[PDB]
Structure formats: structure tokens, C-alpha cells
Amino acid sequence: SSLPVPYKLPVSLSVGSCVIIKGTPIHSFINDPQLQVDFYTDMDEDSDIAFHFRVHFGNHVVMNRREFGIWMLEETTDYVPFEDGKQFELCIYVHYNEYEIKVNGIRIYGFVHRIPPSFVKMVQVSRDISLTSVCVCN
Secondary structure, rough: OEEOEEEEEEEOOOOOOOEEEEEEOOOOOHOOOOEEEEOOOOOOOOOOOEEEEEOOEEEEEEEHHHHHHHEEOOOOOOOOOOOOOOOOEEEEHHHOOEEEEEOOOEEEEEEOOOOHHHOOOOEEEEOOEEEEEEEEEO
């Protein structure tokens, strides 16, 4: 992996920002690998999370947020167009009222903001992936 995992990237996000994550699952899908991305409000891992995104490859994606240290109501979708054993491109676009999640060009979900995205100070990419690159663009 070009980058250690868990990767904790200090960030500053605004409407118009795009988080671009490239990597490869380190296991085949029959072994149930996962990929997790957290939009943290601080470098500390117990800080609140504006947006938690956990993919179970070949299966489904689970999304939540953690406010005042409390996990809120979980959201999911079954649309996980990641392909087994290959590099993916995952972009997260900060729109005015949601995070738009794109997987290899495909929009899968819009996670609606419950706190302003400008409170996000760190993005952590974690679990069963080899990380090729992460970019934050505007």
C-alpha cells in the first residue's frame, strides 16, 4: 500500500470539496473484506463523525453518524458496484445539503448533512484495503 492503513488525513472541507480515494481490497469477496471511511470532526478517534461509510464488499454499504458520542440512525443501500480483486475509485462530493458518494463513476447514495461539512477536520480510511492515493480537490 502506498499509504498506511488506517490512514488519518487532516482535511478542511467546504461545499464543492471532493474526497477521492483509490485502492484495492486486500481480500477476495468470498472472504468478506470491508472498507471504512469516517469524516471525523477531530484527529481523535472518539470525536464525533459527520459521516461514517462502511462497505461490505459484494454485499451492502452501511452509513451513519455519531453525534455527542452517540451513533444515530443507521442508513444503508444494497448498491455496491465494487468489483472483486480490482482497484476502485471512490469519490465523496460535498454538496450544500449532502455528501454524494460515487463508486467507480457510479452515484450510489446521498448522505444528507446533519452538521455542516466544514466541521470535518480529518478523514480516516480504514480496514481491508490497500490504499493507492487519496486526494482532496476543490
